Amino acid sequence: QISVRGLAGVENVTELKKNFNRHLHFTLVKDRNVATPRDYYFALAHTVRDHLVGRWIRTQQHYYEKDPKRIYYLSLEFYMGRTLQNTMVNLALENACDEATYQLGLDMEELEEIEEDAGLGNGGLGRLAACFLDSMATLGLAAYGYGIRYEFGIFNQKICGGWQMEEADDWLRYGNPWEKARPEFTLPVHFYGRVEHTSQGAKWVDTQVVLAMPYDTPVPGYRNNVVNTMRLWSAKAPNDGYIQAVLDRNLAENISRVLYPNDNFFEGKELRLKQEYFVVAATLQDIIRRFKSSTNFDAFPDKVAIQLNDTHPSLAIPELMRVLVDLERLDWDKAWEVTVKTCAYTNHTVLPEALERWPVHLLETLLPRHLQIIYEINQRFLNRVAAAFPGDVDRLRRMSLVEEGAVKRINMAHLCIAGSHAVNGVARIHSEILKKTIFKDFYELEPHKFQNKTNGITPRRWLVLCNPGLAEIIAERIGEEYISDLDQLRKLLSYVDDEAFIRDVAKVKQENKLKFAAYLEREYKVHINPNSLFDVQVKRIHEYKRQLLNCLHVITLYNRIKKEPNKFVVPRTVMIGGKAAPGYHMAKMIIKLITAIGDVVNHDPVVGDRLRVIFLENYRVSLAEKVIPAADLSEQISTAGTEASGTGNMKFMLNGALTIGTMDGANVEMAEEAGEENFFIFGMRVEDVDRLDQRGYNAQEYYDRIPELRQIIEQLSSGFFSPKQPDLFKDIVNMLMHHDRFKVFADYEEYVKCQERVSALYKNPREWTRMVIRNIATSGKFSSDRTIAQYAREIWGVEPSRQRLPA
Amino acid sequence: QISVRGLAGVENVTELKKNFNRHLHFTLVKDRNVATPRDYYFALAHTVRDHLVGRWIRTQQHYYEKDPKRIYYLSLEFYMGRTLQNTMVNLALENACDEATYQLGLDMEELEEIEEDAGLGNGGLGRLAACFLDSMATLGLAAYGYGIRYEFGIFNQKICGGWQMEEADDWLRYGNPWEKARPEFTLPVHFYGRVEHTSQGAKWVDTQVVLAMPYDTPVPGYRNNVVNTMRLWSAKAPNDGYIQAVLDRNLAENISRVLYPNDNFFEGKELRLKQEYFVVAATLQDIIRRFKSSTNFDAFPDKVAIQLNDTHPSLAIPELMRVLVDLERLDWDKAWEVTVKTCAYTNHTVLPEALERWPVHLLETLLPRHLQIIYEINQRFLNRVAAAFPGDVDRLRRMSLVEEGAVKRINMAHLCIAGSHAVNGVARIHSEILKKTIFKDFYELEPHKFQNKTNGITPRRWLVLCNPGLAEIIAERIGEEYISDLDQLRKLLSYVDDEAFIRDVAKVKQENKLKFAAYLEREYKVHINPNSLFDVQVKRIHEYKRQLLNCLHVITLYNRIKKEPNKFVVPRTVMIGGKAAPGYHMAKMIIKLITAIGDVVNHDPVVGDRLRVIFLENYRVSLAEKVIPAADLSEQISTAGTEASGTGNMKFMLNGALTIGTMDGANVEMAEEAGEENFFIFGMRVEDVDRLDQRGYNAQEYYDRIPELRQIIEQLSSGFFSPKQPDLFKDIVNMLMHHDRFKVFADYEEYVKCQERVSALYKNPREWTRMVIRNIATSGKFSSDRTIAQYAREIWGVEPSRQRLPA
Ligand SMILES: O=c1[nH]c(=O)n([C@@H]2O[C@H](CO)[C@@H](O)[C@H](O)[C@H]2O)cc1I
Ligand SMILES: O=c1[nH]c(=O)n([C@@H]2O[C@H](CO)[C@@H](O)[C@H](O)[C@H]2O)cc1I
């Protein structure tokens, strides 16, 4: 059907249908009359998986022989989503399988909807890890993603009376065709015990052993026949009254059972620290095992790179020291040199609540040797600081890896900076903030460590796969090369004045809206006007992301409608979606507020179809793949200084939505790339937030001077939005009025005005689309291929290569 | 190589090697240079499994269309062992795959040793269930085995300082290629709750739901292309602070986690009753579901047979009533008629400690409705009894399903008799015992219910598969038809005087001994003389099986050697093996005694290689497949009246061992079949045991009159066998002297004498072998094909058929 989807050979289609029938019969043990769509999905899934394996074995072989430097990406999260379409896309099978399946009388798109998301992550950070893997394979790096195989991923979100209910994401119920259990590479991981000192140095003894079993999942590059590996560890009990002993094996295996659902918030729970140590211990043995199969650790940093995705795998650092010092018997100083040259650290936040600080009484019980190593790292480090800023006792206490107070804590970020040769933020403004604020002392010590690597997304999933219509019309004009070289999108700038491209860009958008509006009605009782501006805010629910600000705009538009009912307004469907962590009380209330607003707004007959407020249930990767291509307006409205980068913001830019946003995170570079005239920027910059903090933020001031805002608070306070529980939202009004860390009211005026400007442009279809073209045409920078090539040259010291391997 | 192993086609061998390489590459994702023997096993396993599936789908199709009556075999145990060789045997692939694999430069026999036993059972009863399935498929019945998929089977037995250590049988670690998960047929099973009464009868409410997911494993008949199904249920939690809630799912899934290791001993534990209800609830829904896919339950008994393997699935009875009365709204009396016509019960014991008697306070909490139904069944039943024996208040209390006492109990055997149309023992003497003793009252009520179905074993596993040498020489003489018609073995009787057959039967035995003697040395440090008589007792360790009697013989032979050292004795390797249930203290001591005897006997230089005592570690199915073909003497020495049937006894008869045994269980019919001159029978009959019980058994009497016995007890008492712990065995001497329920000393004289006669015959090789021929030639009766054909005609009302289905 469409060109970017590859060829449908007469030989390829014929082969595909014969393997499909083979899998149905032999692998699934079904026949044509008993088979359900789920059996058909599986038959196709095994049939595509067959095309990978050849390439997988051949890639792993190549690396064994070329012996290049290896990249290890350690993360507690890999937010993968569905695998099948992505695999087809990367292998050029999409049109073949579509043909092959249609010939069998099946609809492939209907089959695709059956795959569970691999929801092994929470949001931004987990999904970055997934995009990065796609980019690393596409750039032919010998890269390995390591993590944990959680049996349960992020919970599925149900709304019930407008409240979130969590249920377990049992994603493996029907099996996962993509993974390959590798029980032969099972490795022990130790916990508790105690530390003994001999003539021959420290020994870690009387430990509990947990086994770590790996599962390998293939990671195909984009049409280069490179297939890299993602290795995820599962917890198993070792084999050594009786009934109870067998049942107790579960305790050990609980380690990999469930993903912690707290995003951008640290919870200091033991089970979590076990998970962190677990993935780090098994991964280093596996790394070292591979290194020995080429005694001499001098070349270890020329053969190994370890990238820490935030501080979650920070135990890599004392653990590599432990292995090098206690087991391999290198002297401390040489070990340290090796460690620092091997490791690098990416920070993804400056929010105090999000930083990991582990109580010492935890580490002592669980990992008594690592604590020792950490103390030693601390002592030697502080000696460097003292030597460089003599007499500065205050710097010494600020820089210490150990924090004093009611409970002593280890600050893990300090550990990562000390033990890594590079530290990087994830957008330019966020890297500057780190250097000016929380890591200012560290930067003064070793300015050479600090870097920036602005985030990107993969154009495979985020354009070719979720938006074939747009990818197609881009392809008509400029060819296909841009899929692995997104900078080529600039070429589209000479088409901004082209009446036919204009008409086509608008049409692709109108189709995605028509489809999404249907998907809304088919899977939920809704009814939305598809001529309206689609105003969407999708991301995890957090105070700093300021969903509440969006709510105040929505309430304002509604109050203005009710005030002058027969005045023309640009109609809108406001969609807000995302999950709250189960313990985040405020977050759960915001979801309730949102639906409570939909109950009033969506039933007011006076409002018509001019305003619809929808909360989108179960925001997840595969839901992002649908709503983003349908979006007109992207809401990126965090308080300046709090969104480290953002990446949804890039997904929307790439898919033809315009952005209303603050000068935060990667928004700053997006607007710089498209030009600020092509972006709706409002509100405080970082500097303004600081001026406000110095004076002190008093929200009453905005409530006294802005009558439209006063009215909303009064509606909230008095029960207008919860008629049966007048006081439902006293928590929200309370927080907004007395302890808003995020200054919602301070940006409200300027947000509303900026929203009026969006509405005005939307009234002129042609000029809206031309601005769209100017955004899409400048999104090249935000390709994760660009990002990874920067990591590769500036941190890992490997050369990317876009060269095909043979099939 | 050998004829019974099928053809090696030029096309079949070529096809097999291409699918082997396909599985290695596509399924296992290995290549020729990284593959281990374990990968090779798997490639072959998937390759043989491919030949089943065609036949499996086709068999299930046939049954859907012919709509025959269905047999459901409910068991808490299916002791399956390895699947691969059995599958090859039944499909006639053995020689092909052997050729195919040799051509690939592999040794198939070495590959076979890699498969885990499916040890989903304890011993006799579990293994009967496995033999029965093979027989049901071979006889073309539309039969289904239902059970539980335990994640851990019978523990692996290690000896450590001569004590048993248990470790977990983690049989699924590497995956099970034979099973097919069927998550689409998941069914709810309810627990706890309470009972409500409406206008419309009882309702069972506020229950906890556990999901039952099935796994199907193919059961191939012997060369008839019938492939039946064994369906095993796994426990899953339903999908509906948060961390802890996810981890707690494990509680629900614990139901199918582990097999109870108590054999011939009832433990009244909750977890066990949950398991019993679990398999029964899921199985009936599945049965009824299938019945509805043909409102009218009158024909239910013409379409369904349910066979209860002991009382373990006795809840089938009130559960079918529950479904029929509460859910389908049949009146009580019609339901009952249907139930009784559907169900039949096989008893496998008369040991009081082995009978299930469930505390009422358990059933009430767990299954409050079933208790009600059981009370109602009891009331109506006792009204029949009262009506038939009026005034006999003692019979009423003896026959009650409810036992009074400190705790009220439900006697489940009474439930099964009341609610079944047939009750059967498992050997002729055991069926007579039931009618004369424990079920005498029941029999007087309904003599027509009581039957006998003498156990059998399958000649596929127990001859063709574990003993190809002997199967081959039998085949030379009489053809192959006897493999599915074991009665044809009589024909071998005209070869008893044939010098060449004699020489061949002896040679097959000598080879199996040479192999087993090697297997001993290769896998353990041993050294055994392969010219010696191989004296083997393998079975679970129990007081009633009288391993202790064997020990007293062994000790006696040794004392006599030490008394006259330069006298000739027939040399012997005594091998004793079997597992003890983890809580059975006495049983664990016997194992210790046995090894303690090996430590003295096997190092006495005066003894030479004339006497060796070996304890065979980890007795299990696949170990039985090796030691039985190597055996000369089979020890079947339970006290008359306690071994319900025995089945090892038949395995040995079939494989050319002679039997020393008491007149117990199926020994009585084996000797009747071979003639008593061809059998070494010693000791009390049942009648003698009763005479003894009436007088009273006083063991001192034997200790005072038999000096050889007195000496052994003194050696045991004084520390001769435990020199560092003089008192190690005071428990044993104590029990033997004051509370031996099994009368070891009473049979000792007569056992020793009978053992001298065995030794005498062994001195004349030719006459030993002729007697061997007379045993093997009369084992036909003990084929489980004979047994199942009897169940089929006399209980289930279906006609067996040996007719091929087409391929
Ligand atoms: O716990 C976390 N969860 C996240 O989603 N991020 C996100 O990390 C993304 C990846 O860099 C950033 O775009 C984003 O701004 C940041 O919030 C960081 C932490 I630390
Ligand atoms: O818990 C049990 N375990 C067993 O192995 N059997 C056995 O059941 C076998 C199968 O009928 C008999 O041969 C044997 O005599 C009997 O002991 C019975 C019970 I009840």
Which spans in A368-411 are helix H? 368-388, 393-399
Q: Distances in Å between the alpha carbon of B36 and those of A58, A792, B33, B111?
A: 19, 36, 9, 10
Q: How far is A235 from chain B (nearest CA, A)?
A: 12
Cβ–Cβ below 8 Å for B53 and A29: yes
| A18 carries a ligand binding annotation | no
Beta bridge partners of B344: B307
Resolution (A): 2.6
Q: Is A247 on the interface with B (CB under 8 A)?
A: yes
Task: Record the tokens describing residue B218, joined without a space.
Answer: 């193919």
Instruction: Inspect the interface and report whether the beta carbons of B166 and A254 lie closer than 8 Å.
Output: no
Residue with tokens 């961390």: B243
Q: Decide: helix, strand or coil at residue B293.
A: coil
* Rounded-to-integer distance, Cα B291 and Cα B323, Å: 14
Q: Tell me whether domains B1-456+784-807 and B457-783 share a fold.
A: yes
**CB atoms B583 and A242 under 8 Å:** yes
Task: Report the alpha-carbon distance of residue A294 to residue A70 in Å, rounded.
Answer: 12
State the Cα–Cα distance between residues B478 and B490, nearest whole angstrom: 10
Comparing alpha-carbon positions, the chain A residue that sits nearest to B30 is: A57
For residue B346, what are the β-bridge partners? B309, B424
| Upper half-sphere CA count for residue A283 (Cβ side, 13 Å) | 34
Experimental method: X-ray
Of B5, B540, B553, B743, which one is the catalytic site residue? B540
Token pair for B624? 């039985």
The letter for the amino acid at B352 is P
Rg (CA), chain B: 27
A31 lies within 8 A of chain B by CB? yes
Structure tokens at A510: 């109108």
Length of chain A: 807
H or E element: which one contains B88?
helix B84-91
> What DSSP state is assigned to residue B152?
B
Residue nearest to ligand 1 atom 5, measured at CA: A124
Cα separation, B250 vs A566, whole angstroms? 60
HSE toward the beta carbon, residue A382, CA cutoff 13 A: 18
Reduce the DSSP state of residue B115 to 3 states and report it: coil
Whole-angstrom distance, CA of residue A86 vs CA of residue B98: 42
d(CA A307, CA B316): 58
Type and span of the H or E element at B98 = helix B94-103
**Taking every pair of C-alpha atoms in chain A, what is the biggest distance, in angstroms?**
90
Measure the CA–CA gap between B373 and B318, rounded to whole angstroms.
6
- How far is the centre of ligand 2, averaged over its atoms, from the C-alpha of B556 (Å)? 30
Active site residues of A: 348, 539-540, 545, 647, 651
HSE (side-chain half, CA atoms, 13 Å) at B475? 16
Rounded distance, CA A701 to CA A726, Å? Answer: 25
For A198, residues 6+ apart whose C-beta sits below 8 A from its C-beta are none
B-chain residue closest to A252, CA distance: B247
| CA atoms lying within 13 Å on the CB side of residue B600 | 19
Angle at A519 between CA A600 and CA A117, to 5 degrees: 110
Encoded tokens for A14: 């014929």
User: What distance, in Å, lies between the first and last C-alpha atoms of chain B?
Assistant: 25
Closest by CA to A307, choosing from A350, A346, A348, is A346
CB B667 within 8 A of CB B649: yes
Neighbours of A783 (CB within 10 A): 29
Helix (H, G, I), strand (E, B) or coil at B65: helix
Distance from CA of A156 to the nearest CA of B (A): 10
Contact call for B246 and A152, based on CB within 8 A:
yes
Query: Is the four-CA dihedral B487, B489, B492, B493 of positive or negative sign?
Result: negative
DSSP E strands in B199-337: the ranges are: 201-220, 227-236, 304-309
Distance A413 CA to ligand 1 centre (A): 15
Task: Report the DSSP beta bridge partners of residue B217.
Answer: B230
Give me the residue from B240, B243, B257 closest to A167, CB to CB. B240
* CA A648/CA A627 separation, integer angstroms: 11
Q: Residue A631 is encoded by which pair of tokens? A: 């979006």
| Distance from C-alpha of B474 to C-alpha of B465, rounded to nearest angstrom | 14
Ligand in closest contact with the CA of B310 = 2
How far, in Å, CA of A478 to CA of A469, rounded?
A: 15
Q: How many CA atoms lie within 13 A of A66 on its CB side?
A: 13
> B246: Cβ–Cβ under 8 A, 6 or more apart, which residues?
A152, A168, A257, A258
Residue position matching structure tokens 């000790």: B555
Query: Is A645 marked within a binding site?
Result: no
Q: Which residue of B has its CA nearest to A242?
A: B582
Give the strand pairing for B533-538 and B572-577: parallel
Which one-letter amino acid corresponds to residue A338?
Answer: V
Rounded Cα distance between B388 and A314, Å, is 81
Contact B242 A271 (CB under 8 A): no
Which contiguous run of DSSP H or E holds residue B365? helix B360-366
By the 8 A CB rule, do A474 and A482 touch? yes
Beta strands A70-74 and A304-309, pairing class: parallel
Active site residue B647: yes
Structure tokens given for A628: 């983003």
From the CB of B128, is ligand 2 less than 6 Å away? yes
Record: contact A29-B247, CB cut-off 8 A:
no
A588 near B CB under 8 A:
no
- Does residue B668 have its Cβ closer than 6 Å to ligand 2? no
Pair of tokens at residue A695: 């004076």
Q: Which residues pair with B806 in a beta bridge?
A: none
DSSP per residue over A694-721, as a string?
Answer: HH---THHHHHH-HHHHHHHHHHHHTTT
Q: What is the position in ligand 2's atom list of the atom closest to the CA of B126?
A: 5
Phi and psi at residue B417, in whole multiples of 5°? -70, -45
B184, B241, B246 member nearest A257 (Cβ): B246
Which site among A157, A169, A185, A243 would you substitute to test the B interface, given the most B Cβ atoms closer than 10 Å to its Cβ?
A243
A473 closest CA partner among A463, A459, A460, A485: A463
Instruction: Please give the Cα distance from A650 to B380 (Å, whole number).
Output: 76
What spacing in Å lies between the alpha carbon of B454 and ligand 2's midpoint?
Answer: 12
For residues A538 and A547, the answer to whether their CB atoms sit within 8 Å is no
CA A394 to centroid of chain Cα atoms: 37
Distance separating alpha carbons of residues B742 and B548, to the nearest angstrom: 10
- Ligand 1 in contact with A346 (CB < 6 A)? no
How is chain A split into domains, by residue range?
1-456+784-807, 457-783
For residues A110 and A37, the answer to whether their CB atoms sit within 8 Å is yes
Please say whether the beta carbons of A210 and A191 come within 8 A: yes
Q: Which CATH class is domain B1-456+784-807?
A: alpha beta
The two counts, helices (H) then strands (E), for chain B are 33, 23
- What b-and-e string marks burial along A81-117, b requiring 16 or more CB atoms within 10 Å of the CB? bbbbbbbbbbbbbbbbbbbbbeebebebeebbebbbb
Active site (annotated) includes residue B18: no
Q: By the CB < 8 Å criterion, does B447 face chain A?
A: no
Q: Does domain A457-783 have CATH number 3.40.50.2000?
A: yes
Task: Kindly state the DSSP code that residue A625 receives in the 8-state scheme.
Answer: H
